[PDB]
Amino acid sequence: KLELRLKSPVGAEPAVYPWPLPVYDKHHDAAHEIIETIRWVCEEIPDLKLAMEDYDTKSFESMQRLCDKYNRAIDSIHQLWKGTTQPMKLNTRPSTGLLRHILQQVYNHSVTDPEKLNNYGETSFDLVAQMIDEIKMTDDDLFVDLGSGVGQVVLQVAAATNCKHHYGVEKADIPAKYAETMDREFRKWMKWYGKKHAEYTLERGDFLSEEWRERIANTSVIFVNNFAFGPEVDHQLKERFANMKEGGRIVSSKPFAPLNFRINSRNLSDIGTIMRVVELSPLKGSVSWTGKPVSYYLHTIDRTILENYFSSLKNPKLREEQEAARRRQQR
């Protein structure tokens, strides 16, 4: 029983891999996970990168010499820390590049069958990363991913931001079950790298349920990939969003209200009356399964829109303007 071992840079339990090195799917195997782990820990620790400076991934001797060189380097770094040199971070967030590796790693050891996840740590990572950069979140924010799958988007945001809490709600059995493993693996691997994450919870359930009505209402930042949602589900969501607090934000792949929404007495009930909607900057060179560049939509709860409309009704000048417009429009 041959093995390959990688020591943790912060003294956690070693990562152990059986030889021959397992294959996860067509584009991921343990060999490259080992190589990627080594070189990301080198990015973590400059002295390590400085010492390390990796040939045949199908030779045991070649791979073992790679792991040995890494582990011996780690030992020297730990001795270096016992001296006058200050130890590593231990409370920092992972860089975007490292976080991508970690999530991929977590996915590799959680989802043993990527084939029964038949939908439509994927390469939405960069999309979500762009949103994390643009949508500012603080420690008073509550984050929710509506329909969170195996939970990778929640994990990514939780690793990146300092929201008070992050939630993922998932309805189906299989992804919710995998999410339990994703959760356990994530906490383990983040510790292995010595990286911090904000609080998060991956739950089972339906976000249309009566329980989630109040929960949505109290959420300050919602991510929902709703592009392929039918009109009934989207309508139900609009009803939920209507109870959100001022300044509450919804980021989605399909708008919940029109961008050029003009309020009148025919659309007084519509969600557009209480939110600003903008199309966010797309990420250069993206493209989705439809072959089009990905666009995102930011909704911000703002009830001054409605307030100002009601004020305008009290103004006789504005009133004539509105009423003359309506009659002209009906043509």
Site of interaction with ligand 3US (CB under 6 A): 124, 127-128, 131, 145, 147-149, 153, 169-172, 175, 206-208, 223-225, 229-230, 233, 251-253, 296
If the CB atoms of residues 31 and 131 are measured against ligand 3US, the closer one turns out to be 131
On whether the CB atoms of residues 157 and 139 are closer than 8 A, the answer is no
Other Cβ atoms less than 10 A from the Cβ of 111: the count is 23
Q: Is 147 annotated as a binding residue?
A: yes
What is the CA angle 186-148-228, rounded to 5? 145
In the complex, least distance from residue 127 CB atom to ligand 3US, rounded to whole angstroms = 5
In the complex, least distance from residue 205 CB atom to ligand 3US, rounded to whole angstroms = 6
Q: Which residue from 222, 283, 288, 282 is spatially nearest to 256, judged by alpha carbons?
A: 222
Position of tokens 């200050």?
86
What is the distance between the alpha carbons of residues 268 and 24, in angstroms, rounded to a whole number? Answer: 53
Burial of 163 (0-12, 13-18, 19+ CB in 10 A): buried
3-state secondary structure of 277: strand
Q: Is 61 annotated as a binding residue?
A: no
Which token pair is 40?
């990301």
Q: Is 151 annotated as a binding residue?
A: yes
On whether the CB atoms of residues 238 and 256 are closer than 8 A, the answer is yes
Q: Is 208 annotated as a binding residue?
A: no
If the CB atoms of residues 106 and 128 are measured against ligand 3US, the closer one turns out to be 128
If the CB atoms of residues 61 and 232 are measured against ligand 3US, the closer one turns out to be 232
In the complex, least distance from residue 37 CB atom to ligand 3US, rounded to whole angstroms = 25
Total length of the chain: 331
In the complex, least distance from residue 331 CB atom to ligand 3US, rounded to whole angstroms = 39
Sorted by sequence, the CB contacts under 8 Å of residue 26 that are 6+ apart come out as none
If the CB atoms of residues 32 and 171 are measured against ligand 3US, the closer one turns out to be 171
In the complex, least distance from residue 178 CB atom to ligand 3US, rounded to whole angstroms = 10
If the CB atoms of residues 14 and 114 are measured against ligand 3US, the closer one turns out to be 114
If the CB atoms of residues 34 and 153 are measured against ligand 3US, the closer one turns out to be 153
Residue nearest ligand 3US, Cβ-based: 147
In the complex, least distance from residue 234 CB atom to ligand 3US, rounded to whole angstroms = 10
Letter string b/e over residues 123-145, b meaning 16 or more CB atoms within 10 A of that residue's CB: eebebbbbbbeebebeeebbbbb
The annotation places the binding site at: 121-123, 143-152, 170, 206-207
The annotation places the binding site for S-adenosyl-L-methionine at: 121-123, 143-152, 170, 206-207
